[PDB]
Write a protein that binds this DNA or RNA. Sequence first.
DNA 1: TGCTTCCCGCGAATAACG
DNA 2: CGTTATTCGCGGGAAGCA
Length: 122
Amino acid sequence: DDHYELIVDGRVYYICIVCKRSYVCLTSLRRHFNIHSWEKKYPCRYCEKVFPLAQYRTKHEIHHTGERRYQCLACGKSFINYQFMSSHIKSVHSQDPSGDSKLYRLHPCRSLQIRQYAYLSD
DNA sequence: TGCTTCCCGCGAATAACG
DNA sequence: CGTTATTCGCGGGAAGCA
Ligand SMILES: [Cl-]
Ligand SMILES: [Zn+2]
Ligand SMILES: [Zn+2]
Ligand SMILES: [Zn+2]
């Protein structure tokens, strides 16, 4: 196979055969296991780099386009990702975006073609 | 030690299937 | 096209880096 299961207290866990990492969702183990197999490739469409997860490539490509999707709603500054946005708000505004903040806006991705969540443009 | 990347549960978007 | 199976964007913590 590619995993085995483990059950404690009815809780079902899926364990990677290779590194023994534990997953609550089989789809997550599948997502993860590509790291070992490289069955699927995700090549950057701007340079040579290849990635083993779709999202690693996506985040990498955002760096190529320089799009800044995360905007601080307190002062208007924009950031390329959640982490810089959160870092900013905690440091400059002494507030936490965690949970439902209403402190930042995530703009739709426009600088390349990725699946669009409807909630991002209402 | 302040960035930077890596990770995984969750659930919306969509591809596969019949 | 209707169901379901699959993909992968998202949050936000953890791990890595130099
Ligand atoms: Cl922008
Ligand atoms: Zn593994
Ligand atoms: Zn690239
Ligand atoms: Zn701000």
